[PDB]
Scaffold this active site. Sequence first.
Site, PDB file in Angstrom:
ATOM      1  N   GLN A   2      22.666  15.813 -36.897  1.00 33.53           N
ATOM      2  CA  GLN A   2      21.766  16.782 -36.176  1.00 33.53           C
ATOM      3  C   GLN A   2      21.827  18.050 -37.036  1.00 33.53           C
ATOM      4  O   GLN A   2      22.910  18.571 -37.368  1.00 33.53           O
ATOM      5  CB  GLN A   2      22.214  17.054 -34.766  1.00 33.53           C
ATOM      6  CG  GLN A   2      22.009  15.774 -33.923  1.00 33.53           C
ATOM      7  CD  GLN A   2      22.295  15.912 -32.473  1.00 33.53           C
ATOM      8  OE1 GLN A   2      22.297  14.873 -31.758  1.00 33.53           O
ATOM      9  NE2 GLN A   2      22.470  17.140 -31.984  1.00 33.53           N
TER      10      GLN A   2
ATOM     11  N   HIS B  64      31.999  12.718 -26.571  1.00 34.89           N
ATOM     12  CA  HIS B  64      31.339  11.474 -26.698  1.00 34.89           C
ATOM     13  C   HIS B  64      32.258  10.282 -26.422  1.00 34.89           C
ATOM     14  O   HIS B  64      32.052   9.168 -26.949  1.00 34.89           O
ATOM     15  CB  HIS B  64      30.683  11.366 -28.060  1.00 34.89           C
ATOM     16  CG  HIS B  64      29.397  12.190 -28.163  1.00 34.89           C
ATOM     17  ND1 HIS B  64      28.655  12.284 -29.309  1.00 34.89           N
ATOM     18  CD2 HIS B  64      28.748  12.964 -27.205  1.00 34.89           C
ATOM     19  CE1 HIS B  64      27.574  13.112 -29.068  1.00 34.89           C
ATOM     20  NE2 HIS B  64      27.655  13.576 -27.827  1.00 34.89           N
TER      21      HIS B  64
ATOM     22  N   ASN C  35      24.519   9.889 -30.123  1.00 33.42           N
ATOM     23  CA  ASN C  35      24.880  10.445 -28.808  1.00 33.42           C
ATOM     24  C   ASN C  35      24.730   9.333 -27.705  1.00 33.42           C
ATOM     25  O   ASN C  35      23.702   8.664 -27.668  1.00 33.42           O
ATOM     26  CB  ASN C  35      24.041  11.692 -28.387  1.00 33.42           C
ATOM     27  CG  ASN C  35      23.532  12.481 -29.566  1.00 33.42           C
ATOM     28  OD1 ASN C  35      22.841  11.909 -30.418  1.00 33.42           O
ATOM     29  ND2 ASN C  35      23.868  13.775 -29.632  1.00 33.42           N
TER      30      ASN C  35
END
EC number: 1.1.3.10
Lengths: 90, 90, 573, 573
Positions: free
Chosen positions: D403, D503, D548
Site C-alpha cells: 500500500q 492482521h 488485508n
Amino acid sequence: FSYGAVQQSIDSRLIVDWRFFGRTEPKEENKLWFSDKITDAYNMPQPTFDFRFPAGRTSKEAEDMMTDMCVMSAKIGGFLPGSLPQFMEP
Amino acid sequence: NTVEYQKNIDKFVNVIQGQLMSVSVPVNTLVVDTLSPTSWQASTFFVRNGSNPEQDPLRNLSGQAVTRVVGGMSTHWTCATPRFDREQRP
Amino acid sequence: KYDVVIVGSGPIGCTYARELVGAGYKVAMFDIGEIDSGLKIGAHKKNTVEYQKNIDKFVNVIQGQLMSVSVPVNTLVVDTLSPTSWQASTFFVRNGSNPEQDPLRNLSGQAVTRVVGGMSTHWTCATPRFDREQRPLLVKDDADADDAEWDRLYTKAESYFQTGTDQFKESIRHNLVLNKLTEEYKGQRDFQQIPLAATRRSPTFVEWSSANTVFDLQNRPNTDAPEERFNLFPAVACERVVRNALNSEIESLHIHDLISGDRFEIKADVYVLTAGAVHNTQLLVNSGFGQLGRPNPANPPELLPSLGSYITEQSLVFCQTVMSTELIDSVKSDMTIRGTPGELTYSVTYTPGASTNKHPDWWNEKVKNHMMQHQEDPLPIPFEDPEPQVTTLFQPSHPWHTQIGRDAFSYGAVQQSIDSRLIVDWRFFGRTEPKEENKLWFSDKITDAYNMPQPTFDFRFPAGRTSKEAEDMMTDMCVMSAKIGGFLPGSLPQFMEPGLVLHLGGTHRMGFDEKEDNCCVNTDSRVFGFKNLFLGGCGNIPTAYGANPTLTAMSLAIKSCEYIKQNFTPSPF
Amino acid sequence: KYDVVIVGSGPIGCTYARELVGAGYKVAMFDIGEIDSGLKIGAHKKNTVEYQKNIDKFVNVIQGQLMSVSVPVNTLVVDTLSPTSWQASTFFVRNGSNPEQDPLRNLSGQAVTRVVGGMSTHWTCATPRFDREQRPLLVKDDADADDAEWDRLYTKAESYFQTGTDQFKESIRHNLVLNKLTEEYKGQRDFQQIPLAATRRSPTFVEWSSANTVFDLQNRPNTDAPEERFNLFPAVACERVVRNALNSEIESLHIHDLISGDRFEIKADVYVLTAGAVHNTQLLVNSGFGQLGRPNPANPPELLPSLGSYITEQSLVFCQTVMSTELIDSVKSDMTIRGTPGELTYSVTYTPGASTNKHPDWWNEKVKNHMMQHQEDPLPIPFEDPEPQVTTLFQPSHPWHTQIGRDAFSYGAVQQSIDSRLIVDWRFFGRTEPKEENKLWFSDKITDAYNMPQPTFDFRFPAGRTSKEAEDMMTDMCVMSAKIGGFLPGSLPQFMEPGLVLHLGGTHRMGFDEKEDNCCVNTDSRVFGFKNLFLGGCGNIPTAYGANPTLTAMSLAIKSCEYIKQNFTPSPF
Ligand SMILES: *Cc1cc2c(cc1C)Nc1c([nH]c(=O)[nH]c1=O)N2C[C@H](O)[C@H](O)[C@H](O)COP(=O)(O)OP(=O)(O)OC[C@H]1O[C@@H](n2cnc3c(N)ncnc32)[C@H](O)[C@@H]1O
Ligand SMILES: *Cc1cc2c(cc1C)Nc1c([nH]c(=O)[nH]c1=O)N2C[C@H](O)[C@H](O)[C@H](O)COP(=O)(O)OP(=O)(O)OC[C@H]1O[C@@H](n2cnc3c(N)ncnc32)[C@H](O)[C@@H]1O
Ligand SMILES: *Cc1cc2c(cc1C)Nc1c([nH]c(=O)[nH]c1=O)N2C[C@H](O)[C@H](O)[C@H](O)COP(=O)(O)OP(=O)(O)OC[C@H]1O[C@@H](n2cnc3c(N)ncnc32)[C@H](O)[C@@H]1O
Ligand SMILES: OC[C@H]1O[C@H](O)[C@H](F)[C@@H](O)[C@@H]1O
Ligand SMILES: OC[C@H]1O[C@H](O)[C@H](F)[C@@H](O)[C@@H]1O
C-alpha cells in the site's frame, strides 16, 4: 565514529556498520567563500558555503548508492533499529 | 593508540567530536515558547552564539568541521587509504 | 422563522437552550461540528466503561479534537534528504501554516474543538467559583449586593452542571494527599476537593458532566417535552450576522450547510453567539464588528473597537511527583503484620474502632484486604483506589488556582516503570492582566479550513504583576509538591506552551460602559447598540482570573437569559 | 428467546446480521463496547467534515481505541528519583502488566477495540482479494470450482462493503506515482488502485465504509424494515457459551451487563461468535474449549485441541519518501511559463487537446489554475489534490501485499517541515507460515480488565520461508520506493512492532477435517461436533496471507450464513 547513542541491548559482536561514499561532479557554482564582515574565532574572514549536490549524475548516483547499501547489507543481516539507512549531514 | 582506548573503543567517538569545530553554523530560528514570563526573551532570531549570518542554511555543508591540533585530523582518522582508479583520479 | 437562534452547542450554548427552551421559546441551534458522543448527544466522551477502565488512553480523544488555532510558518532545517528528492529553496508557506503569525508572539497551544457539545465532550469538569479578586462586578458600589448576585447565579450554574465536592471522599490517595497538605499549611492555607461537575455512580465509575447534562440536545417536541420547541442542526457553519443600517438590530444569520454545500439565511427574534472565545470573535469580525485584518490604529473601527483586544490567557505550570516513602508507610500505620508475605502464616490485622488508630475502619479494611489478597504487591494502596482531586483555591497570598491529582490530559509519553498509584500531578494556573495590546485578530487575506478569516494572535504575558506572579507560582509549585514527594523524571517542573491551557478570555469582553470599560457586551451579555444580539462564553470575562472559567461563563449566561425572558415574548405554539 | 445471537458488532458480526435479519431470523447482537460514531451506529469515525479537513488528527482516534493485548512486566531503570520518593526493590507486577508474558516472544503491538462497529470504526478500508496462493480451499480437488466459489463470495462481500477501485482516479499524486511505477516495472509487475471500501461524495469528501455500511445496526422492526427483528445490546460482556453434556450443542450464552452489573443467560437456536481473533478464542477457552493456562502437552485438551495454535501475524515494513525533483517537474511538463511569478505579466498556459501533451486536459487545467492562483507556491500540485492509493498485489515473485500513499495511521510525530504534497507512505505486508508452536493462550491466574483470563502470546516469526521473505520484502520496499524519491528523515525503512499491523489469523482456524487439517471450524465456519455454534472473523483463516484479511473473513461469513439459512428455520413473527 558513531553517529548516535551507542546501544547496549544487542551484542556488539553481531553489529556491522555500512558506509557508502558517493562522488560529486565539480561545478563552478559550488563554492567556499569568506566574509568581508564576519570573522571567526581567530579573527580571520568567516567561511561560508554555497553548496548543493549537482543535479544529474551526482544525484542519480547518490540515490542508487543508497539502494545498493540496502541491497548489499541485507545479505549480512537486517538493519539495527536506531541505525536505519540514512544520508548523513552534508 | 592508548591501551585505554583500545580497551574502550566505544569511548573514542568523544575524542573525535571534541576536536571537530563546525565551519559554518547558520543563524538558529528554533522557537522556544516555554520560558518563564520573567526571563529575557528575544523579539527576533538575532545573530547569537557565534553563528554566521552570511550562511544560507539550505545551501550549506553543515557537517563540515575542522581540527586545530598538532597532527591535524590524522590524530583521530579511520586510517583508510585506498588508491583511486583512473575514473576518480586527475 | 425561530424565536431564538444559538450558534454553538457547547455548555454555554446549552445554557441558553436550557433556559429558553424551558421558558417556551422556539429555539434553533447550529453547530459546525457533528454528533459524536453516542446516543447521549453532546455527552462526555470519558463516560464509557472502556475509558474508565483505560483512562490513560483518553488523552488520545482530547488530542484528536484540538485543532491548532494559529501555526506559524515552519523554518526547521532538514538537510539529510536524498539528492534526488525535491528540495525547498525557502521556508515557504506550507501545510496550512499562517504567514501572518509571529512565532514569538503566539498562543501556540490554543486550539478549538468542532463537535456537538464542544470542548465539554473532553473537559476535566473542574468548576470553581471565582472570589471577588478574579470576578467582574455585576453591581457597582455595593459589594454585598454583588456577592449575593454572584452567589445566586453560581448556585444555579452548579445545579445545571451537577457540581459537587464529595465524589472522591472514599479515595485513600485523595485523603492521603489532602491531609498531608492541610497539616503542612496549618492555618496558612485551606485545601479541599476540586469542585467537579460529576456524579459518582459506583466506586469505579464517575459520570462526568458535559453540555448534555445542561441540556440533552434532543429535538422537541418529544414525549418527555411535548410543549417545548428545539431543533439542533449539526454540520452547519455559521458565517455572518446581518446588521440593519442603524446598527441597532441583527436581521439574519447566514449559514453554510456543510453536507449539501448550500448557503441559507435564518431569521430569528434573538441571536445568541456561543461559538467559543475564538470563533465568536471570528464571526463578529466577519460581520463588520471590530476591525478586519492586521490592526491599524489609523483606521478606527466603526463598531465595538475593543473586540479582540484585552485578551487574556493563563500561565500554566506542571509537574508530577512520586509519593514519598513516609506517606506510603503512613497508609498502613494501623496494621500489625505477622509472618512473611506469601507464607501460610502471614497475617495483617487491625483493631476496628481502636482509639489509637489513625484512619477510619473503612480505610483500614481496604488496606488489610489488599495486603492479604495481593501478597506479591509491595504497596498498601488498593489497585482500584481512585485518584486524588485536590485544590487550594486562589487567594491574595497565593494568586493562582491549583489542581493536584490525576488528569487524563497527559503532556508526554505515559511512563510505565513507576507504579501509577504513586504518581500525583500538579497544575498551577496564573492570572493574566488584560492589556489592550494583547490581541486576537483575523487576516483579510489568509483563510482557515472553513473559508473564514484566519485567526492570528499577538500576545505576550504582561510585564509586571502577571510575569512576577507566574514565576512565583512556579516556585510555589516546587515548594508545595516537595511535601508529597520528589519530581517524576520526565515530568519535571515546566511552563506549558502558551494557550495549551485553553482558558482564553476577554475576546469580546463584558462591562458596564462600552467606552469607559473598553468592552463589547453589557452585564446582560447584550452587544452594545444592538437590541437582539447576545454573546456567551469565556470571551465575556474581562478580568484577570486563574481559576477555570466555564462556571463563571455559565453564570453570566444565566443572567443574560433572565434579560431575554424579561424582554422578548415567545411565539405561541 | 432469540433465533440467533451474535457476539460482536464489528463488520463480521454485521455480515451475519445483514444475512440473517434479512432472511427473517429473530436476531440479538451483543457488544462489550458502546455506541460511539454519531447517529449512524457503528460507522467510520473518519467520516466527519472535521476529520476530512484535518486528517493528520485521525491517528489520535485510532490510538485512543487500541488497547494492548499483552504488556510484559516493565524493567526500565529509573535511578534519578528523589531520595524521599518511594522506590522499588524489584520489577514487580505494576500497571496492569501480564507476568505470564515473555517480552521476547510477544506480539507487543497487538491491540483490541471495544466499541460498536469494532475496528471498522477506524480501519483503512483496504479490501483486496486473496489469490490462490494465500487462500484456504473451499472445494477439494477442483481448482476451477474453488475459484468460482470464491469469486461468488468475494463479489457479494465487495457489494456489502461497497468496494471500488476508482475513487482516487482524479488525483494528480495518485496517477503520478501509479504511472511511474507502471513504467518502471513494465511487464514484470502490475499496479492499480488499492481496492477500497468507500464511496467518494465530492472531490474533498470520501464516505469510508464500516460495519454500518454492511448493516445499519438499528433495532427492528422499524418503519424502513417492518417485518425484520433485530436488537443490539451494547455494554454487554459475553463471558461463556454453555455446552450440553454430549458436546453437540450450545444451550446458552452467559453475559455480564456492564451498566447494571448483573449477570444473565440468553437462549437462542444459533450462536455466532464474532468478537475478533483474540476475543473469540478467549470466550471459547473460558467455555471449556481448548486448554486453559500455560500450554501443557501432557494434558491433552478435551475439545478443539488446535484452538489458539497455528497463529499467524504479518510482518510489516514501513517508510515514507519525499517525491523526486524529476516527478515534480513532470507534473507541469505541458505548461508554457512566461514572465515571473508575482508579476502582472506572469502567464502559465497549455494547449488543450494538443497531441504533444503528456497529460489529460483536466490535469493541465488543475495545474494551470494552481500556478496562476498561488503564485507564491513553488509546487505544481493543487492544495486539495487527494493522496495516492497505490498497490501491486501479492504475486509468487513478490509475495507481500503493498500500500503506497497516505495512511491516517501515522507511527510517529507528524512532521511539518516538508510539504505534505511531496510525501508518500510505503507499507509492505508479509505472509507468515502457520506453526503449531505459535500460540495465543489464556492465563488460569491473571485476569484482564473485564475479569476474563488474560491473553498471552508465544510467538516468533518462523525460521525458513517466513523470515527469508520478510527480509526480501524489506529490500523490495527499499528498491521500489527509490523510484519515487528518497526516504523522509524520521521515517526510514523499518520493521514495525510485532502485531501492530493487526492482521492476526488462525486462532480458531478453518479446514475440512478437524484432525488432518489441525483446525477448529469446518468450511461453513461451524465448530466441529456442535450443531449450532459458528465462529466468524480472521481467526478462521488457516493460511499464510499478506493481503488485508477482512474481505476474506466476510466472504467466509457469507458462506456460513448460507449454511444457517439451509439448516435452521426462523421463528414466525
Ligand atoms: C576527522 C576525520 C577525518 C578522516 C577520517 C575520520 C575522521 C572522523 N578518516 C579518514 C580520513 N581521510 C582518509 O583518507 N581516510 C580515512 O579513513 N579523514 C580525513 C583526513 O584526516 C584528512 O583528509 C587529512 O588529515 C588532511 O590532511 P592535511 O591536508 O594535512 O590537513 P589536516 O586538517 O589534517 O591538518 C591541517 C592543519 O593545519 C592547521 N591549521 C589550520 N589553519 C591554520 C593556520 N591558519 N595556521 C597554522 N596552522 C593552521 C590545523 O590545526 C591542522 O593541524
Ligand atoms: C479541551 C479542554 C477544555 C477544558 C478542560 C480540559 C480540556 C483538555 N477542562 C476544563 C475546562 N474548563 C473548565 O472550566 N474546567 C475544566 O476542568 N476546559 C474549557 C471548557 O471546555 C470550555 O471553556 C468550554 O467548553 C467553553 O464552552 P462554550 O463557550 O460553550 O464553547 P465550546 O468551545 O465548548 O463550544 C463552542 C462550539 O461552537 C462550535 N462552533 C464554533 N464555530 C462555529 C461556527 N462558526 N458555527 C457554528 N458552530 C460553531 C463548536 O463546534 C463548538 O461545539
Ligand atoms: C485498527 C485497524 C484495523 C484495520 C485497519 C487499520 C487499523 C488502524 N485497516 C484494515 C483492516 N483490515 C482490512 O482488511 N483492511 C484494512 O484496510 N484492519 C483490521 C479490521 O478492522 C479487522 O480485521 C476487522 O474489523 C475484524 O472484524 P471483526 O471480526 O468483526 O472484529 P472487530 O474486532 O472489528 O469487532 C469485534 C467486536 O466484538 C467486541 N467484543 C469483543 N469481545 C467481546 C465480548 N467478550 N463480548 C461482547 N463483545 C465483544 C468488540 O467490542 C468489537 O466491537
Ligand atoms: O491542560 C490544562 C487543563 O488542566 C486541567 O485539566 C484543568 F482542569 C483544565 O481546565 C485545563 O484546560
Ligand atoms: O498499521 C498497519 C495497517 O496499515 C494499512 O493501513 C492497512 F490498510 C491495514 O490493514 C493495517 O492494519
